[PDB]
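Lab intake sheet, docking and co-folding queue.

SAMPLE TYPE: protein with bound small molecule
LIGAND NAME: chloride ion
LIGAND FORMAT: SMILES
REQUESTED OUTPUT: full 3D complex as structure tokens
PRIORITY: normal
SUBMITTED BY: R.K., bench team

The fields below were copied directly from the construct record.
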Amino acid sequence: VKNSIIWFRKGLRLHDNPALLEACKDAKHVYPVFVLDPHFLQQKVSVNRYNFLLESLEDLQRSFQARGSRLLVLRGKPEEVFPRVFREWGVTQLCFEHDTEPYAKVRDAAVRRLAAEAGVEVVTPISHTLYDTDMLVARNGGAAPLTMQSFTKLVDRVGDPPAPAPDPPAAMPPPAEDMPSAAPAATGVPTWQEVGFKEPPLTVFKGGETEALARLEAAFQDPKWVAGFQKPDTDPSAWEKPATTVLSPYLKFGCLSARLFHARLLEVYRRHPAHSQPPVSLRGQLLWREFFYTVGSTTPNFHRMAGNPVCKQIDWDDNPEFLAAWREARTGFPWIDAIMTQLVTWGWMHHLARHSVACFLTRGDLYVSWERGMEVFEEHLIDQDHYLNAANWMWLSASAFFSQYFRVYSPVVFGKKYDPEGRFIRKFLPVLKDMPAKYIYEPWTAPLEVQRKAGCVVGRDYPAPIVDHAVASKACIARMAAAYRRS
Ligand SMILES: Cc1cc2nc3c(=O)[nH]c(=O)nc-3n(C[C@H](O)[C@H](O)[C@H](O)COP(=O)(O)OP(=O)(O)OC[C@H]3O[C@@H](n4cnc5c(N)ncnc54)[C@H](O)[C@@H]3O)c2cc1C
Ligand SMILES: [Cl-]
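RESULT FIELD (auto-filled):
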């Protein structure tokens, strides 16, 4: 008979899941599996991101229980757990969504070898990306496009991405009873307390497919907003209602299908003819993701400077003091420190807020490597994605895809244009809550009498600027200009 495993790694969803539909097909028993390494901590990851994963698994659990089945969270490494359960469960087919990340390729190969030894058929559909990213490279003549203009041209030549896959059946073949490796007490979803985390998650975005589809429908409640979306014109200071979709954590874990999102965009575009076009449109934002997945998956050492054929070799400074101040939100520049606090508190910041902090640490003020910034973002972002985090840090550091190092964001003026009263700053830096708006972006300029009334004396309650932006940016630009002459 047919006994199948659907292995979740990403794709933590039941919609547009071609691997689950194939697994459930003609199956006597389907085994829904997530593999959790119980020592991933003891070895880098925030409770905000890890708990979002756990909430995503608890949603999957509820969804499978509704359909007569059960999510099995196996503890161990895939290479050691799958050979046993292949034979324990009499598995004939193993299904999972294809992953193009470097560690994914090594892991999936070894598992595919194990499945062959056990007589197990492997089916690996593509669904995390709009397209088969290797088909895009082959249609482009064997190399990934290196500009979005050429990439947008390529996808339009290829045509619409595949349609979202149908929904799974209302009743699923369950695991077989009294299998020892599927015992309930060994296969449940743990809490954040039981994985070793001692401080609670604080983010306001809840994990799971059910919340991802609720947040999708919220975005599409105003079609005219979807149609006219222009990414560079949105507001980074907006926190009560963020100015973009905040679907990124759900797309990263696959709680939301990229293809379903794309299909819903085109239906709105069909009825709104003046709709915005790539790159600034919402569809364009999914294409930024695909562009970076396509380049990054075909580029060696993509997450690194050294050995990376697309990254400029820049002489960044090893300055732990500047880095530490940036990471711990104590630069003395409230726009920067507020954004870095939202990072550690919510794990999500608007795209231009990320611009402001990434420029500051790299080609604008502190001249620290974008790798040191990417590592900090990897720990705290709930949307952390190998290829998107790496390419946007190379972009922001003018090390790849971007070359206009004379455009330096001001850590004082940038946010002021959107939020003159500093509502964003007061929310995330309550120490400045009583600071008059005239000084809230430059508190070191306030007379001492003003500092004492507001309760924020610089050097006592809030740090002093670690640099003079005018001096620092002028130095950093000079150095960047000599490097671009050096290459
Ligand atoms: C230094 C830096 C690091 C970043 N690291 C990440 C990361 O780890 N994970 C991540 O998802 N994005 C990352 N981004 C890209 C971008 O800032 C986020 O995708 C965006 O802020 C998510 O908000 P949203 O879902 O509201 O996006 P929307 O504007 O609503 O866009 C919809 C979707 O398009 C995709 N998208 C949007 N902007 C980009 C972009 N610039 N590059 C690639 N895909 C994009 C995302 O999947 C996003 O959810 C980074 C950007 C910078 C400057
Ligand atoms: Cl500016």
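REVIEWER NOTE: The pocket of flavin-adenine dinucleotide (ligand 1) is lined by residues 231, 244-248, 251-252, 285-286, 288-289, 292, 350-351, 354-355, 358, 377, 381, 383-385, 388-389, 392-393, 396 (CB under 6 Å).
SIGN-OFF: pending second check by T.M.
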